């Protein structure tokens, strides 16, 4: 089986640089180019240059050269591409690339693909604030409600409502990175309104790289 | 050269004939490889030089195509073929078409929802409005403050297409400062989906 194995997630602070690994086996290493190639969050994929694994010759986008760099130790089949001056929209996942079929280069075989998070953040615990049921978030005899987990740094955090007891209804929404650097999600539920006078509604946002746990009550 | 996709987006019922359409601008083509992608993993290779299947693969997916224009079809389609689909062209790859399951079209419910007053605390306010299970995906948010429009200080986020109902539901957050929120009086996201007649607009006032 062919197979690329790339290093795991990296942190950078703009300015900096990553270096990022391609383990390679099932195959002669030698034989075809290594190609390297970007993802934005919710977007198309992008070419950044191919190399020669014989001799490290090197052929690069006119957008990427002098910010990229591909090398290659031969000896352990492993191949290596070093990006350069990281901006936020370096932000993406990159995957190192190789091609199964003879006398062509294009056709390819994934690695997992390696997030890179371009951020000056450091780890944060999220700040969670209601977002309470009222006139304005009712219709028909529904309401809605939810969570807002803001400023946090890194990914992931897990969103539950009173403990697992409430899932339907219930939408987690996609981290966004903000421009400061820390991700911000929200998380909502719909419910009867008949029930906003009775039924107690906790959150309970837990973010295990800062430790930090926080329920809180959305009341009206 | 340049390949340019369509559909952008796909929606159709599980065992429906499935074509997607690839075109290159330069005209010379005889070799194109086709992605599928699903979300959260690597790429995987479903057909090179036009017509021919990686090993693994069904026989319900075919390629075609000469010159200018190349096709990747689903003979029926299959629950585990929902994904995005990429072709390709030397360094060059299309904008990718993500294939949709559909259901009968459906309105957005639409919420609004004030800074709380802890946030205000912080020094910085946050809107938010909630688009509630709604078919298609595509639906545009405005946000609108004493009815004036506000651009690139809005965020937003969606979710996959949910497994049981087949809607998306959509989160818009609206981001201001404390003393900007406080300076204004009408809050308001104006939603446009094909499911509403005309535009609804949910607001609250400070």
């Known amino acids: 089986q062919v197979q690329l194995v790339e290093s795991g997630t990296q942190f950078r602070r703009p300015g900096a640089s990553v270096r990022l690994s391609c383990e390679a086996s099932?195959?002669?290493?030698?034989?075809?180019?290594i190609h390297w190639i970007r993802q934005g969050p919710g977007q198309g994929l992008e070419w950044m240059g191919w190399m020669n694994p014989r001799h490290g010759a090197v052929n690069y986008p006119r957008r990427f050269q002098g910010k990229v760099t591909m090398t290659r130790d031969t000896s352990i089949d492993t191949a290596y591409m070093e990006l350069r001056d990281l901006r936020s929209d370096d932000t993406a996942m990159y995957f190192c690339?190789?091609?199964?079929?003879?006398?062509?280069?294009?056709?390819?075989?994934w690695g997992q693909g390696t997030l890179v998070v371009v951020s000056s953040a450091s780890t944060k615990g999220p700040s969670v604030f209601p977002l309470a049921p009222s006139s304005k978030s009712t219709s028909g005899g529904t309401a809605a409600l939810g969570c807002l987990v803001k400023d946090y740094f890194p990914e992931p955090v897990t969103v539950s409502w009173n403990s697992g007891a409430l899932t339907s209804g219930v939408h987690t929404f996609p981290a966004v990175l903000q421009s400061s650097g820390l991700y911000s999600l929200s998380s909502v539920v719909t419910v009867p309104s008949s029930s906003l006078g009775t039924q107690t509604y906790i959150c309970n946002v837990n973010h295990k790289p800062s430790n930090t746990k926080v329920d809180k009550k959305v009341e009206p | 050269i340049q390949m340019t996709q369509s559909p952008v987006t796909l929606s159709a019922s599980i065992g429906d004939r499935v074509t997607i359409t690839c075109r290159a601008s330069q005209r010379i083509d005889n070799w194109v490889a086709w992605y599928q992608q699903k979300p959260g993993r690597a790429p995987k290779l479903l057909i090179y030089k036009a017509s021919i299947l990686e090993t693994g693969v069904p026989s319900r997916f075919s390629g075609s195509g000469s010159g200018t224009e190349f096709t990747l079809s689903i003979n029926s389609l299959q629950p585990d073929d929902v994904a995005t689909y990429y072709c390709?062209?030397?360094?060059?790859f299309g904008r990718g078409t993500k294939i949709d399951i559909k259901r009968t079209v459906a309105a957005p419910s639409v919420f609004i929802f004030p800074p709380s007053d802890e946030q205000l605390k912080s020094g910085t306010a946050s809107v938010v409005c909630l688009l509630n299970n709604f078919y298609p995906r595509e639906a545009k948010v405005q946000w609108k403050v004493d009815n004036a429009l506000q651009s690139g200080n809005s965020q937003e986020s969606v979710t996959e297409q949910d497994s049981k109902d087949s809607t998306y539901s959509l989160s818009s957050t609206l981001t201001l400062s404390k003393a900007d929120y406080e300076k204004h009086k009408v809050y308001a996201c104006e939603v446009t989906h094909q499911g509403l007649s005309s535009p609804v607009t949910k607001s609250f006032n400070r």
């Open positions: 390709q062209q030397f360094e060059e």
């Open positions: 690339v190789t091609s199964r079929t003879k006398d062509y280069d294009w056709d390819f075989v």
């Open positions: 099932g195959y002669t290493f030698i034989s075809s180019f």
